[model samples]
Target: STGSATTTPIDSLDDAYITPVQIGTPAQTLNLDFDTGSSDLWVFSSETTASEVDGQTIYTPSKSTTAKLLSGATWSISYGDGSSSSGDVYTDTVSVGGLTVTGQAVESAKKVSSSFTEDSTIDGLLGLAFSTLNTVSPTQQKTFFDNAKASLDSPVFTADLGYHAPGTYNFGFIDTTAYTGSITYTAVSTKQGFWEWTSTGYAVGSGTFKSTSIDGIADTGTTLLYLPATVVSAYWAQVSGAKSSSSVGGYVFPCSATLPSFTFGVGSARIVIPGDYIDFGPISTGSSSCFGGIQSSAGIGINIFGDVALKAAFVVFNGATTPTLGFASK
Candidate 1:
């Protein structure tokens, strides 16, 4: 069987995508951020302290007849952005789109960082990464996808992230019409518990395509595209007034700068991101200095092809014995 659901961006910058998920016996619906970079299905819940709770919808597991506490199990996860969340675990009926899975692990947040509390658009996060990345201790739990894989017609999921618009996430089967042209498949490594793959190379605007292997992960959880320092510096050099600013925490340029497009290779296929996409957004509300969509992953160890790159193409996360990633022009 297959399931499909619409995911909407939280802001004009397409910072995050939120999809509606049904949890518990009576189905407590909440908008959850579907993250491909992490593996922990956590939510703001009744257990969260009042001081930490903001406008996010909290899950009241006590009200669900199907909910059962996972004795002694707890989880905590922190991100590169410094945001973190921790809580105890529960097993309940969870459904996405129309796909249902019983006894799904649902982590209820006992505490959350300021960043998460300030974000009112998402009530929780639904992790799609491999179960090996799950943070639960003692008896680690499987991700929703891992638990549902046996019931699905095909062990796969596709992400159709959009730019300033809504997209769809499909489970079980790939929708042929969701993307244009044939998909180019590349082998992926789960050693790091991520959908990691090596890009053929990249190009700045209309320049020549560099033939070098750039290893990175397809992370929908992140906002910007982070590459090697050399690659990032190369792209920004083309833009007048662009500079790496420590105060701004990244590369910034004049909002009116004539930014060039970015291209990256997936196997033999090339996907070009429009120049406009490279101009992330203003440093502030109406600041003349705009932050770039591409940044350096120097200290981060792993490069990340986040939303900035994912929004440029249709991506498929194949969950076969030998997992692979598929990219297509859209």
Candidate 2:
């Protein structure tokens, strides 16, 4: 069997993709951000601190007869952005799209960071990364994708992220119709529990390709694209009146300046990111200075191909015994 879900971008920033998920017998539905960067399916729940939850829909285990407490099992996780959440665990029947998992570990949050509280658009996160990254203490648990893979028609899922619009996430099998040409498959380094891969090279709009090996992760959880300082500077250099501003904290350009498209390679396949996508809107509301979606990864230690890049191509998270990644133009 296969599963499908509608993933919609939150706000004009295209910050995150939220999808509907069902939990427990009565089918309590919540909008969750489907992230491939981490593992641990958690949600705002009745157990969460009242003040910590603003407008998120809380999940209550007591309301469902099938929900069972996972004794003494606790989990804590923090993201690169300094936001975090922690709580005990529960096993309940969970469903997404048409696929169902009988005993999925549903981490119920007792406390959440201020950032998560302020983002009322998302009720929680559904991690699709490897189960090895699960933060459960004493006993780590499998992710929703990992647990449901056995029952799927194929052990795979794909992300078709959009630009300020609704996209689609297909599980179990690849929807050939969703992408154009053949997918360029590449080896993935899962040892670090990420969908990490290396690109052959890149080219700045109409320019010759630079044959440099750039390693990065395809992270759906992230909002912006972070590349090496050299690559980032080269990109910004192409745009007029662009500068690294201390106040804005990143490269900003005049809103009137035209941006060049960015292109990166996956094997022989070339994925072109439109110039419009790189213009990440104004730094301040109604301001003439706009932020660039592509920034430097100097401080982050690792380059991240976030939503800015992912939204330009169709991505596949292959969960076979020997995991691999696939990218295709839409």
Scored by lDDT, the top model is 1
Instruction: Report the lDDT tens digits of candidate 2 across residue range 225-276.
Output: 8999999999999999999887888899999999999999999999999998
Q: Worst lDDT window (10 residues) for model 2?
A: 8-17
TM-score of every candidate relative to the true structure: 0.99, 0.98
In model 2, the Cα lDDT at residue 99 comes to 92
TM-score of 1: 0.99
Candidate 2: clashing pairs of residues: none
**Mind giving the per-residue lDDT tens digits that candidate 1 earns over 121-213?**
889999999999999988999999999999999999999998889999999999999889999999999999999999999999999999899
Note the residue pairs that clash in candidate 1: none
Model 2 misplacement above 4 A = none
Please report, as a residue range, the 10-residue window in candidate 1 with the lowest summed lDDT: 272-281
Off by over 4 Å in 1: none
Please give the RMSD of candidate 1 to the true structure: 0.8
What count of clashes does model 2 give? 0
